[model samples]
Target chain A: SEPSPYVEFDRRQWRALRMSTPLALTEEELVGLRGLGEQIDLLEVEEVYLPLARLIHLQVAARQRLFAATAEFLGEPQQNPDRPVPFIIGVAGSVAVGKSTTARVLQALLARWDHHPRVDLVTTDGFLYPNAELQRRNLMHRKGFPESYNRRALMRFVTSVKSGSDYACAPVYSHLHYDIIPGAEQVVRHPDILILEGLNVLQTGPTLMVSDLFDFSLYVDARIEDIEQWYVSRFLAMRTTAFADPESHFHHYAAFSDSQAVVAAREIWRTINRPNLVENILPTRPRATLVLRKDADHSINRLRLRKL
Target chain B: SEPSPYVEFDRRQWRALRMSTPLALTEEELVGLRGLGEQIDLLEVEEVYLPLARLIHLQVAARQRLFAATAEFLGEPQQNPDRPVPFIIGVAGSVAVGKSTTARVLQALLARWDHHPRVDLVTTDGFLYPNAELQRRNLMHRKGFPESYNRRALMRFVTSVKSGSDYACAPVYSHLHYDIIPGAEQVVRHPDILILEGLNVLQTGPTLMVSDLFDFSLYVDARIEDIEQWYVSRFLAMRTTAFADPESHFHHYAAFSDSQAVVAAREIWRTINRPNLVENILPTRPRATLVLRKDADHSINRLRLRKL
Candidate 1:
């Protein structure tokens, strides 16, 4: 039979797989996992994440073997003894695609794997130019596009990781403030795996210099209509909750009525974000090594892995 | 007649088109054109360039109409009464594709056009960071990649141009010195046309912000094999000529034998340049409004214009 574009798994397929030993979560974890509900926790970990982790582990092993053979063919005496295998996993999707959740969850799961497992997760947000830069350029309305970030620094960080650095650091950004927090960094210490999550992780710039650095790339996708709805819902939720906080940079947005907020959200989405997603982000979907297609409920309904 | 992609002209077509006027070349100009020969002199003002200048003038007129229509649609009042129509032309291609020659020829030809014809040409080279910065970042080899540039300053220059500033300036670089000469600048005033020549001028970064500023964009293309041969030939020529100058930063390269120069050129092409061309520059071909496809002789053999 021909290989399917999507990686499908029914409940039977899920039950048949021999699961890896689960990592136990403390009460503090349970408290943080509130509002998402127990069903979500069970489904994500058992049905979705465990299988995903196992698949990635297999990929890592295969990649290592392949690199070894390549080194041998090149007549290198041996694969550089100290060089760590780079297992770069890129997670990309539109806003509110649950990519952040996937990144966090996978980082935790991958760390638990028995094989050289020190997992580091870095979100591309930290590379974004400061709010001042964005405002000075009047790109505050179009902040998610590739130019919004410090691409040079991002490339440097990725190159360092791929070259098997003992330790590498990425700047961290504050989403609440919509700016990079100067001097704050996320460090990776010879991690067995790295998960990079962002709106356009698969994006290759004017030169393939950046994209060629990635070993594996993933795109989270859904119908445009669904994503639009999700964005609006997320915006509404933020208005009622996060935006109401006195310390929140967007606290003034909470003053809008529900209908007004919805209109504003949709307007922003249509004018700025939608155009960017379609032109810059969506066009790069084919460049991904794998694509996770999600349903309206933000659940992974299908997975498409590019054929080797 | 329907528009032909090639914009072909026979001998008769060439003979029938009268030259609007000729640019008076000074002694300095004669020096700049040294070794170019009489064939280039004839080709520059006649068969190759006059038609191009006319086509560009038409494009500029069309763009003004479009911009006016867009402003009217936006219900914008005539706030800036003296807003100059931005006629930005992007010239892009692989290295040694003769973009610099094309830029120089166009600048001279457009200046002779009947319309508001003060044409200015700016090479993106002027915007490249100092060699020291490139060396500090260990990106000396990857000098032409997008990351190797000061994108913010480039964007600012374009923004200022689009903003219809009476005067704007960009730092100038010396290829002989391989650095930006301190206090040297190319002063730009309001011009009828601006030709921006670079390796990746057609690139639309993450936000499409920079790209939106271009009224027209051109990509110079050639077969990869031809480009490789051209690069090797150019490298050999530079070593024997430019690099032989005592003040030339590449004086060390002058010592390389023909074979050694070829090997070094090929190595740099494969490792740094070819990858950048394939990954960054080639992908931007579709983004070009028009493409000038060069033959083995380095003359444009065909043209590919995007279907509007």
Candidate 2:
């Protein structure tokens, strides 16, 4: 049968596949991927991601054509004369949604596509203010909230990129340190496509709101209950693994027992992360052009695309 | 002369009134009724505010009736069995455009009117985070920008008030110290009307994309050039007068020579203040429900109400 443009894998086939590889990968491959017995690849990238990437690329091309017509109607001269239409993609989701892995996979796959062969992925975690600044504001716990970010600087950076600035710089962050690295920077040169992945990349400014900057936006979503469970599991894994590193900023967490770690992670999630997600981040999901709803196994289950 | 339905003071008349009295008065007189002086009398208040208050009262009443109708249509019981409608008035403008004075004056006058006369004035400055937080974010210079304030918190505060919360606590800031005073709080009880004042009180959220919760919003208007001069003059006055106090945070500014103070004031305004007003604040003027245009002397000259 010829493949339908929209139709992909059906529910029964997906369930059978999941049953065969309950962890979404064989144990050896999972161990090889993370160097840990714990399963992290809980979804097949080729089965779910390839179709999603194709859909996103189609949307981006359609958006570019629409924008080109709009520019022509507004009497705007073809300003870029040389470059292809700049396609900026924003990926926003709550913590522990496997969005980072999705972003990385999409970045690699999009680069292989014909239209957008050169894709650059930039995470907004880097643009967050340094830890010293966060500590001074007594917002170290609320660091992921929109208020914790330098919104003006981020706005300027996004505007510069959209305006086709040849070279722009963004601050760099170390996951090991979990804070912005002071002197390090990530230089962003002009690329066919730019993927901005973060918890709150869809946030809007206070005044003069414009939704035209993004060519495509994706929100990785899951039920709050599932997300909370995932968050706890991730914290437990990190405590036994990443936190045990001597140089890790969170190395102290390695001392926490399983129950102690559970309480601490839950407290952190309830007190700070949950509020930030519900109030600041999740509220902006409707603004996205597409939403990718993830199941408990980190597999894309349902997709919602905004009507034109 | 017969009083018009609306107060219409000309620039010449307003200036003449101000010139006849001492421009600078004691702090007690400025803040208290004892120092109101004989320049403007109760007649101005009665003629100008009575009708305006009545109009606002009608608006509130109409809104409640509509809400009641909506509840009936939706088959939901009336949330408030017996409660007055929220009459929210937002006062927005550039710095030193006399919006605070306008809010205070209107609050006093509206209290004398009937059909819900208990009026309360709340400045959005109360919602601004402490100076320490601004410093930590390296946003001390961008103080008046919307990002300088915790927008979600501000929205929640206003929503609570509008929802008829018996009491809401707002943080207090001291202009003399230029910081949020620790342990100081402003408790706002339910009032028939709320006059919210600030630079961008009319700024909207990302999703709703509307300014602060306003039943009727007023934007105080003046020429940008005139406002720049007024800001400089006010800074000069503060340096010579308020900053001279030994306990004042800006006391060091008092020691500067007249020319030096002038240059510093101009520099601060040009570099930090003016750009903020133009970029983030001024663009929100059109969103207001009404506009009060002021003359060079900080007195309202004309009014422009949005066509409902």
Candidate 3:
């Protein structure tokens, strides 16, 4: 038939493409951004996220120029209604597959660019319905599934951002409490770039999907086995830290040993996250603009970029 | 720049594409199937719908063959789970643009074919939230808007149908009551073809859209002015007929003079239907597999077929 729409690159080849892009991120910043059990360092950011940021920057610049050209052709002033909207980037992946880390890295890197200094990152976690609502709907166990989120609210937030609204607010979520905080909102001022990370960030509905507003999108893909392992490891590591707090929803798990914790972690994964990943998230891989395929070591070993 | 993804055809050219397809529909059937203010005859059905039915039949046949081939490669039996799902057809358009007529005509025509005799038709009207629910949500005036319907229920119905379920039930909507009938349901048995008609049949969300399950989709496109005129005419005609019934939700309009009724109709159109058409329905035209472009006379004078 015809040639595939993607150009695949190995880790070495992809890292080489980063060229002379220097790192502005410090060790402390890397530590703050890295997810649980992820050992990503400055080298990983320099090799992986630098190229992605540069690619997005180039795309943003080209789009800005195109917008100016179009506005000039129409004899309109490049302000207000004619001004270009924020460049949206969607980061989707399975639960515990380092989507947050990827999004955080990109957010840090993209914000440093002088052309687009204002960068905002919002996760679908904030869009999830509160625990009370989920319980009322009897969907508490399906929390990470697409149906568990207030998709309409999420769409409205993205729509507001894309419309260049002065302030677009998203609900605030607390991981320790495992619930959406009451009345607390994350207000996003006019941002040059918006990175929305979620398990189902690429999911599309019958009307306009959240990803449809994205200028660029990424799907952090990896072997399911590796993801399961990562999930178990993260859950085990949370025992003495997050789980030990009395306010934490998972405080009861704090006393669990590694063996018992692994059992509980795998049970949760098998029941909830695994089903969501297979049914909802993985199917959206082909819909991504770029795919970051990770190895067992949690490093992105390959990249598949959609050809223009 | 690349050429458009569609090939446009005039009425005569589109009619010519019908070739020697014979009409099995009678005048009585045509009268019963046509909506208020629509006078489409057997000739129009033969000229317009026969070709579309034939085209869809071809696609269905090709897909079945492909399914068989794929199943053979996998060494799976061509039955049960491996069996091809019903070919779904979605008909979407602005209010009063003859979308129902198009869907009805296609449903009647496509069923006569030996390969797909068991054809079923469903309207998204059946998926509309009951008046009580709409009132509770303060969405009574926005009845036909995309948000007015139970989209999740609608999706589940389509999913059940596509999953080859023995029965997929949809709520029953009554025009006389102007709401979804309480506790009443329309159960659809397994069918060879399904035609779903609605104003926002092509509307999409962030997850799987209703049209995502459609094997073929049609958008009845027309000038807004023409549709508004048609809507007003339909409203006037309905006053003596549907609205005259004592149980009709719009019975109040039955007592009004033609001029007064015209004003009321126009206002409703301006306030509700017009906004929905412009903001939701019309934007989804490009998403359709084919578009039936209508003239002021309520006749489809042109057809835009998405190129393969």
User: Could you arrange the candidates by lDDT from highest to lowest?
Assistant: 3, 1, 2
Q: Which ranges of candidate 3 are over 4 A from the true structure?
A: A1-296, A299-308, B66-77, B80-83
lDDT string, candidate 1, A122-218, tens digits = 8899888898999998888778988788887777787677656677888888877657888898888877777888886777654434554565677
CAPRI-style class, candidate 1: incorrect
Q: Best TM-score goes to which candidate?
A: 3
Lowest lDDT block of 10, candidate 3 chain A: A66-75
Better-scoring candidate (DockQ), 2 or 3:
2
lDDT of 2 by residue, A1-308 (tens): 21111222343343332212112234354334342222245345544555556555555555455445323322347754665556788888888876787677677667766553678888888878888998998888788998688766665666666556776788888989888887898888877788988887887654322233566788888888888888998898888688989889999998999999999999999998888889877888766766777777766766655422
- What is candidate 3's lDDT per residue for A1-308, written digit by digit as tens? 12233567887877866756668889998898888877688887887788877777767755455334323322345664445657788999998998888898888898886564788899989999999999999999899998899988887888777665788789999999999999999999878888999987888655556766676799999899999999999898899889989999999999999889999999999999999999999988875878999889987878887532
Better of 2 and 3 by lDDT: 3
> After TM-score superposition, what is the CA distance of residue B285 in candidate 3 from its true location, in Å?
0.5
* i-RMS, each model, one decimal: 23.4, 19.2, 15.7
RMSD of 1: 23.4
The positional error of residue A198 in candidate 2, measured at the CA in angstroms, is: 1.0
Model 1 agreement with the true structure over B196-266: per-residue lDDT tens digits: 88886777654434554676788878898888888888888887788999889989999999889999999
Query: What's the best-to-worst order under TM-score?
Result: 3, 1, 2
Question: Residue A174 in candidate 3 has what lDDT?
Answer: 98
Candidate 2, residue B117: the lDDT equals: 65
